[PDB]
Ligand binder design. Structure first.
Ligand SMILES: Cc1cc(Nc2cc(N3CCN(C)CC3)nc(Sc3ccc(NC(=O)C4CC4)cc3)n2)[nH]n1
Length: 287
């Protein structure tokens, strides 16, 4: 018999040491912290006093208690009973994937590692796909990097458990044009298929080591271009099979886009073969 107000996810703020702010203010009020009890470094997202976004914060916290996967950043606890609200998650030492890609050593982050990243992400999405959840904000900036190129998807502020086949965002809502599928931009309609489209754009960010999508193109012209069947070109050095998958993710009709299960299977096979090849190449100097 547990105590009356026992809540398995709650923890006292005093258990956490708050340190420096992370993400240079780009990700809101998030700080690096330490869960003293375990001398564990953790990430802590908080909410400013006053704020008119408390509901959004609680929802984000709620969703994280519902998902668990090796490639989804893990919620460790929350402080949502009174005033300063906290969301505590495992710490990913290398930060967000976009900056990781923009500052990496390409000798280390090579062809094999890029496929490994996409394989890990598709794995997480296959999990969400089968749970019938939508992420709604897939982008390299929303993925994190740990030791040994470990990659996990994060930022579930818009993640939704779907009841139907689609989700209609409220009128007036604004979205990241470059990662947003046409049906979403035009009718605010989202589905696992719109996440697939987004995944295609994320593959492109990986392939280009973090370049911003649709180079030089004006945001106001993106939709018109897509409608005429324009799509970003194959990045220099990007394997043909990967670009094909990319193009499949950008099929105009959501029903024509592949499933994450299919995407994951494709990358798993490409990663394996590419990995083997890399190890055999190293073998050329040591047997
Ligand atoms: C969730 C999470 C985040 C992390 N790790 C990090 C690490 C990081 N770094 C800054 C730059 N150095 C060179 C490397 C480490 N910068 C950020 S910037 C950042 C901070 C927080 C969030 N997201 C949240 O707190 C969400 C999950 C509720 C996203 C990006 N996040 N581990 N776990």
């Amino acid at each position: 018999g547990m105590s009356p107000n026992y809540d398995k996810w709650e923890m006292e703020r005093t258990d956490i040491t708050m340190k420096h702010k992370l993400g240079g203010g780009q990700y809101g009020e998030v700080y690096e912290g330490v869960w003293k009890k375990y001398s564990l470094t953790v990430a802590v997202k908080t909410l400013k006093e006053d704020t008119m976004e408390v509901e959004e914060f609680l929802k984000e916290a709620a969703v994280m208690k519902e998902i668990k996967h090796p490639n989804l950043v893990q919620l460790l606890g929350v402080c949502t009973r009174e005033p300063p609200f906290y969301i505590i998650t495992e710490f990913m030492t290398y930060g967000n994937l976009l900056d990781y890609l923009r500052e990496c050593n390409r000798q280390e982050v090579n062809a094999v590692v890029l496929l490994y990243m996409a394989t890990q992400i598709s794995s997480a999405m296959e999990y969400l796909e089968k749970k019938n959840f939508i992420h709604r904000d897939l982008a390299a900036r929303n993925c994190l990097v740990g030791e040994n190129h470990l990659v996990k998807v994060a930022d579930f502020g818009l993640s939704r458990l779907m009841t139907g086949d689609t989700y209609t965002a409220p009128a007036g809502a604004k979205f990241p044009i470059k990662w947003t599928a046409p049906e979403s931009l035009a009718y605010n309609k989202f589905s696992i298929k719109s996440d697939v489209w987004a995944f295609g754009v994320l593959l492109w960010e990986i392939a280009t080591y973090g370049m911003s999508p649709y180079p030089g193109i004006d945001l106001s012209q993106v939709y018109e271009l897509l409608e005429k069947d324009y799509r970003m070109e194959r990045p220099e050095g990007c394997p043909e099979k990967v670009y094909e998958l990319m193009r499949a993710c950008w099929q105009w009709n959501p029903s024509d886009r592949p499933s994450f299960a299919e995407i994951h299977q494709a990358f798993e096979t490409m990663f394996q073969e590419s990995s083997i090849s890399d190890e055999v190449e190293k073998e050329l100097g040591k047997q």
